[PDB]
């Protein structure tokens, strides 16, 4: 009738009819390739309408398991990534658990499993984590041992002895650390498993003969990448950090200190606490009823603004701006002010966001010329093409740890950031100080 056959042979698809990537055997009398195809080439012939005659897969059965894993957020989106063509690499930073992201795949999928592991260092732990994760002890190959099991731990050197005779056993094949799996001798292995879902872990999937261009042909594409950095959702900077400690000129601390007595004698009177998130928004809720409390709000806001811009930090940029010898710097503040006196100050050009942008471009232009040595913009470019490179970055405030900024710190900062220095300068003793160790991140 209308059926074709497909068949595995000793580690080969056997088809009547031509499918893509398929050839003819006239030894065989028969389209073959070798049976990773199978997936495809039946995939294809459904996709073609054509109705298939099929004795390919011959599965051990699948044991009863108690799946006692509960997945992280980024190990479950590996899953649910994994899960959309099931023909993949999952890269993970070792300490990340890849284990149980694999456990997890096996316990979804209830279809026999081939865990393949280059070491028998490797084959034990593995037992240990089925027994603990899905409880159930797994079949064994490699080690002395030769158990054969609805899921089976083998090493890559087993595998490759067995290839021919487990190659149509298992529909889930696992390779562990599958970078390895390229190598010699290795690489043809893999392609004689008709296994139709297939899997890799490794944290490191390059190689440096680059043979990882392999991957395609014998797991799949990397289907989820993620770094430590990605995981925890903290940036990292290529660049170093330097913090500069200025203290108040005399003039400050005065001025300072007396907003700062009048904002504290208030909480002492109404028993709050300036470092609290709700006893915050208490003393600004009660400031828009009362004067008193809203003098003392305006205090607190006044003595950041103090800390913030104070003057010292002009004179210890003064102490920089000689010892880094106008290197293509960039210095920053969020308030308009400090850019200008700054500017005044060292004889530097200002980069301000109420610029025309013929001259914000020019000025810009001018630092990519190198005629300038040294600018200052208090705003920063946002949604913006032109970013600025430069190799030094000043910040005048606490506010510069702050991650938003830092990532785009860090594109502008180096063209070759060779540890390339990031400095931000910060008053002592101040509320500047503590937003500069400010939690919030
Ligand atoms: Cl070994
Ligand atoms: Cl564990
Ligand atoms: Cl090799
Ligand atoms: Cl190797
Ligand atoms: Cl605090």
């Given at each position: 009738?209308?059926?074709?056959?497909?068949?595995?042979?000793?580690?080969?698809?056997?088809?009547?009819?031509?499918?893509?990537?398929?050839?003819?055997?006239?030894?065989?009398?028969?389209?073959?390739?070798?049976?990773?195809?199978?997936?495809?080439?039946?995939?294809?012939?459904?996709?073609?309408?054509?109705?298939?005659?099929?004795?390919?897969?011959?599965?051990?059965?699948?044991?009863?398991?108690?799946?006692?894993?509960?997945?992280?957020?980024?190990?479950?989106?590996?899953?649910?990534?994994?899960?959309?063509?099931?023909?993949?690499?999952?890269?993970?930073?070792?300490?990340?658990?890849?284990?149980?992201?694999?456990?997890?795949?096996?316990?979804?999928?209830?279809?026999?499993?081939?865990?393949?592991?280059?070491?028998?260092?490797?084959?034990?732990?593995?037992?240990?984590?089925?027994?603990?994760?899905?409880?159930?002890?797994?079949?064994?190959?490699?080690?002395?041992?030769?158990?054969?099991?609805?899921?089976?731990?083998?090493?890559?050197?087993?595998?490759?002895?067995?290839?021919?005779?487990?190659?149509?056993?298992?529909?889930?094949?696992?390779?562990?650390?599958?970078?390895?799996?390229?190598?010699?001798g290795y690489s043809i292995m893999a392609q004689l498993f008709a296994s139709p879902y297939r899997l890799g872990l490794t944290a490191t999937p390059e190689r440096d003969d680059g043979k990882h261009e392999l991957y395609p042909i014998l797991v799949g594409p990397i289907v989820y990448r993620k770094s430590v950095e990605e995981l925890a959702g903290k940036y990292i900077a290529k660049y170093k950090i330097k913090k500069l400690y200025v203290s108040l000129t005399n003039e400050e601390k005065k001025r300072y200190d007396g907003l700062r007595k009048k904002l504290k004698d208030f909480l002492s009177s109404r028993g709050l606490k300036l470092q609290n998130l709700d006893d915050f928004h208490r003393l600004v809720k009660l400031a828009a009823k009362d004067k008193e409390a809203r003098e003392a709000l305006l205090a607190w806001h006044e003595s950041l603004n103090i800390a913030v811009n104070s003057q010292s930090k002009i004179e210890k940029l003064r102490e920089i701006l000689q010892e880094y010898k106008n290197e293509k710097i960039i210095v920053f503040t969020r308030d308009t002010q400090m850019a200008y006196r700054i500017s005044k100050t060292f004889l530097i050009p200002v980069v301000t966001y109420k610029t025309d942008k013929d001259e914000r471009e020019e000025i810009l232009q001018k630092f990519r010329d190198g005629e300038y040595r040294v600018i200052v913009a208090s705003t920063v470019f946002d949604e913006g093409v032109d970013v600025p490179d430069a190799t030094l970055a000043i910040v005048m405030g606490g506010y510069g740890t702050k991650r938003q900024f830092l990532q785009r710190l860090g594109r502008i900062l180096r063209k070759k950031d060779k540890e390339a220095l990031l400095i931000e300068i910060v008053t002592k003793g101040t509320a500047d100080y503590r937003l500069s160790r400010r939690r919030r991140e």
């Open positions: 009738s209308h059926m074709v056959y497909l068949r595995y042979f000793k580690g080969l698809i056997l088809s009547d009819a031509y499918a893509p990537g398929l050839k003819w055997s006239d030894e065989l009398k028969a389209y073959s390739a070798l049976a990773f195809k199978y997936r495809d080439v039946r995939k294809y012939f459904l996709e073609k309408e054509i109705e298939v005659e099929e004795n390919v897969i011959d599965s051990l059965p699948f044991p009863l398991i108690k799946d006692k894993i509960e997945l992280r957020d980024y190990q479950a989106e590996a899953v649910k990534a994994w899960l959309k063509e099931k023909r993949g690499i999952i890269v993970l930073p070792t300490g990340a658990g890849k284990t149980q992201v694999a456990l997890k795949i096996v316990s979804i999928m209830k279809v026999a499993t081939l865990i393949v592991v280059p070491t028998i260092d490797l084959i034990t732990q593995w037992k240990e984590r089925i027994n603990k994760y899905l409880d159930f002890d797994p079949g064994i190959i490699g080690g002395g041992e030769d158990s054969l099991k609805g899921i089976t731990v083998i090493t890559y050197d087993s595998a490759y002895t067995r290839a021919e005779e487990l190659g149509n056993k298992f529909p889930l094949l696992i390779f562990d650390e599958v970078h390895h799996l390229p190598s010699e």
